[model samples]
Structures are given as C-alpha cells and as structure tokens.
Target: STNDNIKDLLDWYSSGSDTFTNSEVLDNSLGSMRIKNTDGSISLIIFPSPYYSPAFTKGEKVDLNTKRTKKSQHTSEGTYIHFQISGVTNTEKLPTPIELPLKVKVHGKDSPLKYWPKFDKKQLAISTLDFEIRHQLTQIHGLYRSSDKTGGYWKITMNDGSTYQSDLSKKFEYNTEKPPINIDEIKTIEAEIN
Candidate 1:
C-alpha cells in the first residue's frame, strides 16, 4: 500500500499519460504554454516537459516537503539506512493549483547516508533540485519493488552535500556550487573592494 499511495500521488502531480495535439506538441517543445479547454480547465505544458526532464532545477519553483522519516536496519552485508521524502508539490501543468503529496525512498549503507536525518521535517530553500528514476532488477527488494515505476531504483540529490543513492548504483559527483543560490551570484560579480 505504500507504493500504491505514492503512485496515486505521483500521477496526480505529473501524469505521463496526457494526449497532446500537433500544435500543442510544438508549444511544449519550445516554451511553456497554457491552453483553455471547453471543460473550463487550462492545460499547461512546460518546455522540456517534466516527463523527459531529469533535472528539476532547470524548471520553475518546486516546493519540497522535507517532512520525512528515517529508519535504520542491520544486515549481513552492512547496516542500511532508509529514508522517505514525504513531500508535496503543486504542478503548474494542472488546470488548478492542487497540492499532491510525493513519496520516495532512499536506502544505502550507513556511512554516506548520514546527511539524510538532519533534514527531517525541515522546509529548505531551493537552490537546486535533481532526481532520477531508475529501472534495474537489482533494486527489487523490501525498500522497493520491481512493479514500481523505474523498477523502484531512484537517486535524489541536493545542492548541499546530502544525497540518497540506491544500493549498487554508481556514485554521483558532489556539486561544487556553494551554499544558497545567491552565493554563486556573488562570485561572478566584478566587485570593486574599498
């Protein structure tokens, strides 16, 4: 039922099953567009559609509900830490602004996953956001199911050092960008020191 709930929520947020007209396809490919239907609801399509976009940071505002849970377990291989990012987001693609809760889990060996617990139930400002949905047989386990989209393999990363990497997956490089978006902006400015 855990995955079932997540599926329902994800579908509500950004369903992959929408039919588009020929012109509408052009609209989505180039830039964001909004269309009004006879049903009185508008259809919104963001350029580089969310369906194909892996980097969420390139898009507009996305609120992450950092309200989540962290649990640890011991196994013969190693101690594994599990995390759930139970957050919600309102899709601009929707006709009306509706909040839909998102649920995704991250599990890995104990050492590298230490950053997950500190963010529990905290509202963080978005400097960058990126995620991946993977499909691999190895990820089929208690933490995930083969029936899940992307075969339940996922990796979520933040601008900060925090990350969630699935077991057996390759490690991602830590982004060298500094804390907060504004800090990066300051580095580019040619300031005259007094």
Candidate 2:
C-alpha cells in the first residue's frame, strides 16, 4: 500500500557526459523524494550536491541546452542543491511509469560524482522499470588504481538494430608525467551511450 519511494523503483541517470563529477542527489522538496500529485501526473524532486553557484548559473558558464556543461564550476561538494523533476504515469502499480522527455540535471564538484536484466527493448530505455537497459558501462579491465580518472566505450542503434561496445586509463590530462594506470586505480565509468 505505502509504496511512495519511486526512486527505488525507477532508474536515474545524468543525460550525457555529466555522469562523471562525483556528487550525491536526493529530493529537495518539502515532501517525500518522489510523490504522486493529486492529479494523475507524477513528480520526482531531486537536488544535486555541490550545487552549482550563482557564477555558473548566472555567469558566462551558462547558456547551452546540452546536459554536459562546465563541470569546472560547481559549488563545494554536498551543497544539497534544490531542484524538481516531473513525469506522467499511466498505472498506479509499484513502479510508476514516467513518460519520456524528462530532463534531470545535477552538478558534482570538480571532485567526484556519479542496472540491468531482462531483454525486450531492454536497452531501449534508460528510465523504464518494466524492462531492463544495458548501460554498456565502461570498465578498466587491467591493473589500475582508484584515484586515476579513466573513460571507456559503448554503442547502440535501434533504427537498424546494431550495437558496438568496448576502454581505460592515465592522463595529466595525459602529459609527459604519464600517469600510469595505477595498478589499483582500475575504475569503471559510463561509456558513450550511442
């Protein structure tokens, strides 16, 4: 009966490259993290920590509609920024079905930030609860450390049914210093979505 925690049921993700920068997220609304309004529509309120400051929000760092913007301008970590996200569901089941075109934006300080199963259009949607989605998550398969930031590969296609997947490590952004892929620094990251 008391199934209100939609976050536990539905999936959450940063649209594009914003998936990096480490930060925490939770509903900033006065009410629960996820709530179904009096109307049939559903609302998922969330706030990105190390929230973006006035400079980034109002200054030159703003303007682009793209999800991944200036990651270098977020506030201190754990700012618990306040924001809201809404969606429309048809069924009143355990995991409500939120409509598409939902844009959720969060910020993580320059420091750190932030699924599977079933087939049948699994990779088709990232937010769906009924079916599963393949993240094609990137991983450093060899000896690597946890401090070194690394990025990897992923690919997919729906129109013609095609998919390609493969990545790893070390950079000053890759300078002469040659940051070796720390034997223990092997890490994982979300690969290119499509």
Candidate 3:
C-alpha cells in the first residue's frame, strides 16, 4: 500500500506458491516473496521477510552434487552458457560477489572456448553471487555438450584470468549424453586451482 509503484501493492512471498501467514521459512530453501500491486500486476520478489530471510551466502559452499543442468539444458535451441552453483564459502562480510569461469578446456586443448570458454551460471548463486557474463550465446563454443572424448578437464577460469584444472583424467569429457561412462563418458570431476 505504498504511494510509489503504479501497481497496487499486493503481498510478498519467496515463491509463487507461498502464501501469507505461512510466514515461517521452511528450511534454508532460498525463499522469495511477491506483490499483487495496485495496478493488477503481479511481480516476484527475491527478498524475503526478515523473519523468514535465510541468509546463506556468508559461508555456504556450492552444491556440487546437484545436477549442473536440466533436461536438454545445454542443447535447448537458444540458451546461455549456464550451469548451477550451490553452496557458500565466504565469511567476514564481503562485497557483492560474482562467479564466472576464469578459463575452460575442451578435448585436452588449451582455452577450448573460441573466446576463452566463458559463461553465465546465472541467478542467485553462493551468498549473493551471480553470472558476470550473460550474453554472446551465439559466439561462444558453449558446453552445450561434449566436444570430444580426448579427455580433458573443465579448465575453469575466472574473470581475473586464474585457471583451474584437474591433475587426474587427462582424457575425459565433462559434458556428455550419458553417465556410468560406457562410451567416452565423463570420469571424474575433481579439480583444483592455484
């Protein structure tokens, strides 16, 4: 009921399924809120009520076990070079953080991506981190799928130019059409950076 927005302010919920009075934050599931607006329009609000706000960024680590993608997430006709990052690993209060690859590898080749293999695993990741590069889907060699079976690492690189690679599996694929690896399938995903 504020005198600002053109639309009438409705209610807020962390999710479209959330309703008022159920104000309790169910688990640290990354909640949200929405508004009805005085203009008959509906909007989703990422911020939650202080009473239900689940602040996780301060130190939660990214969830590596979760599927880094969805069904055809990589092959969809027009999608950005995206992935998923869950978990937190920061503390002592930090500025707005952004997570982007420092580098990438394909088929054991150096800097596999034409423009250095960069992407955007967008949305809210980590504490308050998100995608740094959000465009150029048509120009980059996205991880839409496995490039080759020559066996290589993610070659993760950040915006600062720091690169990451795994000492193991000098011949493997990170993105493939199958798991349990029977035909040129991915082996291990463990990697490190310096």
Best by lDDT: 1
Q: Write the per-residue lDDT of candidate 3 for residues 61-92, one digit (tens) a residue.
A: 32111112222123345433223222121122
Q: What is the RMSD, in Å, between candidate 2 and the native fold over all Cα? A: 18.6
Q: Is candidate 1 or candidate 3 better by TM-score?
A: 3
Candidate 1 C-alpha lDDT tens digits along 94-149: 23332212223433322111111212122221211222122111122222222332
Q: Which parts of model 3 have CA positions greater than 4 angstroms off?
A: 1-30, 35-42, 45-101, 112-124, 127-139, 145-194
| Cα distance off (Å), candidate 1, residue 159 | 33
Candidate 3 lowest-lDDT run of ten: 6-15
Model 3 TM-score is 0.24
* Cα lDDT computed for each candidate against the true fold: 0.26, 0.21, 0.25
TM-score for each prediction?
A: 0.19, 0.22, 0.24
* RMSD for each of the candidates: 20.1, 18.6, 18.1
